[PDB]
Amino acid sequence: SGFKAERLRVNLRLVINRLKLLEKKKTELAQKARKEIADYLAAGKDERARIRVEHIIREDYLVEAMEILELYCDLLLARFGLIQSMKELDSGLAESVSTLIWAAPRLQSEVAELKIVADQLCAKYSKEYGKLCRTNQIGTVNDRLMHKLSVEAPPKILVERYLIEIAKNYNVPYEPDSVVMAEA
Amino acid sequence: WAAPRLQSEVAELKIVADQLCAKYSKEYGKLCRTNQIGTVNDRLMHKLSVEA
């Protein structure tokens, strides 16, 4: 009881559709954002440009994270026979199932169906496994994805390198923070 | 053997299986579904396996 295979199958397909669409939209919005950084740098407002590129870095990391989750949903669909057949969790699926349960509370603001995918996977493999996933006590959640959805501020050198590349591309004079470039 | 695997797509295949079980008896039908009867085609069972 609780678990319904078709709820999981339908919602996995929906999650892929929604992620596939959000990646495109967010990629386009990053173009518009980078133009705005060049405008701030041209206006000599470098100290603000630094804080505006933190938004760009976070959206870029998020788009990369959405690509990883798209892949794990597509993997659970490809090997959906195993999910439905066994009662134990296979090794091949452990990364995917644990990561999707871990990610859902972070992403479910944007990708509402991802909550239902997580809830069904917890109904299948039990609530206790679901709790061990959400904290990564299960030690199986994908490390790169957890990095990409971290709440920490970007490294100062990443911010500076972003400004250097954007400034170069839009032919705007920029001089990077000497202290940060030295610390690197 | 195949009907329970395929009957999502090929609905009539259920009726074919049900009639063949009515003909040759329910017990033969059960021995088929597990291949205890040792007669189900091997290549077909491979091709409908759930393994990656």
Partner: protein, 50 residues
């Protein structure tokens, strides 16, 4: 309101059913045409068409 009454899971279902019901209508056309073909076999001998 409309995204409640026809949510994406319900759309997914409806589209699956739509597709599967046109598979069935293809099966039905095929066997109407096979019947008509056999019905008028003597009016179109194969060798004459060839």
């Amino acid at each position: 309101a409309t995204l409640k009454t026809m949510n994406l899971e319900k759309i997914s279902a409806l589209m699956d059913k739509f597709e599967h019901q046109f598979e069935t209508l293809d099966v039905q056309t095929q066997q109407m045409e096979d019947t008509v073909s056999s019905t008028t076999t003597l009016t179109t001998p194969q060798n004459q068409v060839d």
